[PDB]
């Protein structure tokens, strides 16, 4: 059984990765499982998707200050 | 200010609601001993930001339907900047009991919601009424079944 | 483990800070998300999948349209997420264009075909 | 045994008849402008006044539709017309997912009338506060249309406030264009002769 | 009829407005708001009682109670037309039982109060007699709609067979109280034709007056915010 | 019902228009116009196969299509009155032109129908441009 | 008068809070902390004196 | 209410109804007593009427009266926080002890 779940959970994580690179979001490694993680508990995705809009936005901000 | 089990003895005599007065007097010495053996065992056995322990809790609150009241905590913990005092009610928290009860519209600001609201409040009040005088003619059922005399 | 504790991290690994250094973005972020938990609108991953489509079309990438299709298919097909419509509503938010020149015609909502709310 | 309409029969009537069509048991008296509800079959007083009560709902919704209707065929109400008309439709769009929402609710019940007479209340309210301003503003046209609205934003009420306020802004939205094009353009659009300034060829 | 010397009063009060606008245009409501009965939040002008079960009786009381209480006629409990501006009157069905009849007319008041606000709101809401008694009407709406909410729930909770008579005299006290407020503001305000700071005074005044009762008070002075609003 | 087949009449209507106004015949800017006029279609169809979905869950009724297709039955009414005049007038490259701008400013009452009516003219007016 | 608006609105959070700490339980408590006592210690002593004090209670009240 | 509800259920005796009834007794002797030296009294007279009640021995009437007590000070001690920090009388009864001579 949990030879099954962990074979599953790596390829949905390869088809995720291949869907991001293709569509070319822009997302590094670390949205590996947590971010969407947090989105399959229900969680409104506009919302989340604000949020790390906005949360990007800062990051270019401070890597802009920074540099 | 005082020492650790003359402090102890305060706040185990302020917790306990103490028939005979020498029950009473046992009980507090059994709280006395268990907090004297409580803080025993936890300094012979002997992290995140505060802030961040507190929007984990203020988070869960605006999940649990309760925005207003994290937005009071928020303004309570701004007005604060006692950080173990925190941590301690913070650990603490949801140790009481339970709560089940607690210009204008543009024309599309119709909303269901605001209607549904007080339909749900004007239920909420009527059901708790009729719970109580079921639960008060239970107790009366039961005392007309029970001997009387204890 | 918590989602709290799981946004929190996220936000970490997004500002490369550490947890008490991200509190005031962290505030705003918790602000946000207790504006909302559950969507507003109906689940349904065929009209994300044909604005995906739309949009690769939009990006003048027919061929990778296709592939995104079929790399559609093989998730359903070894289905093991049950929400798939928010992770999809995410990456389509987080979809960038790298390979053409910004610039869009504005879309319409009630011209076109628009949510029904739930 | 005699006729009487179920509580569920009398509640998709009157939801037909909040829609604009009348119901199996209750009809558009058009003589009097509201629906009555036939005596063949035996309902009780407190059903039948709670029908009048709502279908006066339906008839401002029928008026109102009629008025949209009159005035959407004619290309020489000009573009202000057009938005009143505008306007109009969309609050009537806004009072139709109302009713919507109320026959989800109703087939949830598959909701009593008087819930529903409750919850008719704030839609009677605005459709009323909206039928009035389009009688005031009926056979007026341009700056007769502004003037109507004006004179209704007069109103001291502030959900009535609200919506006309709403309104108002939506149909200056021409009417400010218009100026700004003779602001800006020094030019008119008027061939229906609804801007202030006249230009004589 | 309360309704023709309303509507002579309105007349009278459009003539004064427009001879101090220097003619200048003036708001009016079609005619039909206030020439449609159909339209009003009052009252709209069976097996006999008497042939019933006590508790029979009981319960075909409390339909035509629960009709009454929203200004709609029961089967054996009906209303009587007005004549001026009254709080409405009942006739009440003589062959019910004389203590049901008395613990009705007990819980009558409120629906008098209730046509009373009912007049006062449309009276009130016509352009001509100015914003402060057009935002009077409005909160009195409010309240009127948070009776309605109450007596609707308690609809609901009947027709789960779960209350009776003494079930709802009890729940209905608070709001007896509220509407008793409701219709001695209604009939002072009418009564005084109070308009502008006039009637501001008026809420003032009472205001301070019904400092007693902090169910009262608390009404009160949402009223008078409410109402101020456009004066101030 | 009969309130909303209208919107099925008017898609016959647009369909007709489509076919015979992309016919090499009926000009370049006649081509172009059944061209957007089949994406804005195309949107339709997405939305009516978003409500056959909740048909399939069990989760539309009457009244809350009758709510669901109002922005749609705008959309359509005025894309078949301007494939109508379009037709009707025989317009052809600068005539279409003309005709597209005088609707879009008759049109400008209502914000959905100027948004469709600028994205056709646009689209429509880059060829002759 | 800084440490009795404080110990207030600690009383007022904590009661938000869903914790129920008193006025003499706080008082302790920042006693303790200014003592230097670990806030995780106090509160583990807290909860179990608590679960104490409810049995001890319960007795109590079957053993009048 | 709640004693008509429990009838309606049987259809108890009456004797249980007197035992249910034996707390309200009590509770409208206490109110029926505080109405009668209550009466005939305002202002001030009306206070000292009420308060001469609190000094009965029975605490079930003692709280009773104590809660009523201070409901009917809560507008007399308005009334003289008014007088006490504005100077100045609503007075148009004449039941505050401070009078004003215009």
């Not at chain 5, 009278?12 to 079609?30: A, F, I």
């Not at chain 5, 508790?55 to 009381?61: F, L, Y």
């Not at chain 5, 409701?182 to 305000?189: E, K, Y």
Request: glycine fraction near 6%.
């Amino acid at each position: 059984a949990a030879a099954a779940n962990l074979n599953a959970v790596r390829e949905t994580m390869d088809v995720l990765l291949e869907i991001s690179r293709i569509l070319n979001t822009g997302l590094d490694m670390e949205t590996l499982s947590i971010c969407v993680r947090l989105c399959e508990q229900g969680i409104n995705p506009e919302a989340l998707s604000s949020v790390i809009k906005e949360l990007r936005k800062a990051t270019e901000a401070l890597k802009a200050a920074e540099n | 200010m005082a020492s650790v089990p003359q402090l102890l003895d305060d706040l185990c005599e302020a917790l306990l609601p103490a028939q005979r007065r020498g029950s009473r007097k046992r009980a507090k010495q059994s709280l006395k001993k268990v907090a004297y053996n409580a803080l025993f065992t936890n300094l012979f056995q002997d992290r995140l930001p505060v802030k961040n322990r507190i929007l984990m809790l203020s988070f869960d609150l605006r999940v649990g339907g309760l925005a207003a009241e994290a937005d009071r905590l928020e303004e309570l913990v701004e007005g604060l900047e006692l950080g173990s005092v925190l941590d301690l009610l913070v650990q603490l928290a949801g140790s009481g009991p339970p709560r089940v009860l607690q210009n204008v519209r543009y024309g599309g600001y119709d909303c269901c919601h605001l209607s549904g609201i007080e339909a749900d409040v004007r239920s909420i009040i009527s059901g708790e009424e009729e719970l109580c005088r079921d639960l008060i003619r239970k107790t009366l059922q039961v005392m007309e079944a029970a001997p009387g005399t204890g | 483990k918590s989602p709290n504790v799981l946004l929190q991290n996220l936000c970490c690994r997004i500002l490369g800070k550490s947890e008490a250094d991200v509190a005031q973005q962290f505030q705003y972020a918790v602000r946000v998300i207790g504006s909302n938990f559950a969507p507003t609108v109906e689940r349904d991953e065929f009209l994300v999948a044909e604005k995906i489509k739309k949009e690769l079309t939009r990006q003048r990438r027919e061929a990778d349209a296709a592939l995104f299709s079929e790399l559609h298919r093989k998730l359903h097909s070894q289905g093991v997420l049950k929400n798939k419509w928010s992770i999809l509503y995410l990456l389509l938010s987080l979809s960038e264009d790298p390979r053409k020149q910004p610039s869009k015609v504005s879309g319409y909502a009630a011209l076109f075909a628009q949510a029904l709310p739930r | 045994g005699a006729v009487e309409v179920t509580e569920a029969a009398l509640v998709r009537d009157i939801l037909y008849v909040f829609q604009g069509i009348d119901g199996k048991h209750v009809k558009m008296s058009n003589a009097d402008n509201c629906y009555t509800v036939e005596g063949k079959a035996n309902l009780s007083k407190s059903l039948r006044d709670t029908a009048v009560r709502l279908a006066e709902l339906g008839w401002l919704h029928n008026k109102i539709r009629k008025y949209t209707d009159q005035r959407s065929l004619d290309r020489s109400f000009g573009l202000v017309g057009q938005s009143f008309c505008a306007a109009l439709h969309q609050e009537l769009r806004e009072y139709y997912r109302l009713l919507s929402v109320l026959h989800s609710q109703l087939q949830l019940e598959d909701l009593t009338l008087r819930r529903l007479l409750v919850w008719t209340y704030d839609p009677k309210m605005r459709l009323k506060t909206l039928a009035a301003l389009v009688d005031h503003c009926q056979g007026r046209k341009g700056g007769e249309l502004a003037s109507a609205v004006h004179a209704y934003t007069k109103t001291g009420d502030p959900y009535a406030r609200s919506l006309v306020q709403h309104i108002l802004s939506l149909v200056s939205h021409p009417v400010l264009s218009f100026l700004y094009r003779w602001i800006y353009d020094g030019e008119l659009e008027d061939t229906y002769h609804e801007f202030f300034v006249a230009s004589d060829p | 009829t309360w309704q023709q010397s309303l509507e002579l009063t309105r007349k009278m009060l459009r003539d004064k407005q427009s001879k101090k606008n220097s003619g200048q245009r003036l708001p009016v409501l079609p005619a039909w708001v206030y020439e449609r009965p159909a339209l009003l939040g009052d009252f709209l002008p069976a097996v006999p009682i008497g042939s019933l079960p006590l508790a029979s009786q009981e319960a075909a009381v409390v339909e035509d109670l629960l009709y009454v209480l929203v200004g709609v006629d029961g089967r054996y409990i009906s209303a009587q037309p007005l004549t001026g501006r009254q709080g409405r009157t009942f006739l009440v069905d003589p062959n019910l039982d004389l203590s049901i009849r008395e613990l009705v007319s007990r819980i009558l008041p409120v629906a008098a109060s209730y046509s009373t606000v009912t007049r006062f709101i449309e009276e009130k809401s016509s352009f001509e007699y100015g914003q402060v008694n057009h935002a009077l009407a409005a909160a009195m709406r409010t309240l009127v709609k948070e009776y309605l909410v109450l007596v609707t729930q308690l609809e609901q909770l009947q027709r789960q067979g779960l209350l009776s008579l003494q079930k709802l005299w009890f729940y209905i006290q608070p709001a007896m109280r509220s509407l008793d407020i409701l219709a001695s503001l209604a009939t002072s305000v009418d009564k005084g034709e109070c308009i502008g700071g006039a009637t501001l005074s008026l809420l003032h005044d009472r205001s301070f007056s019904y400092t007693g009762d902090s169910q009262a008070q608390e009404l009160c002075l949402h009223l008078t915010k409410a109402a101020s609003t456009p004066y101030f």
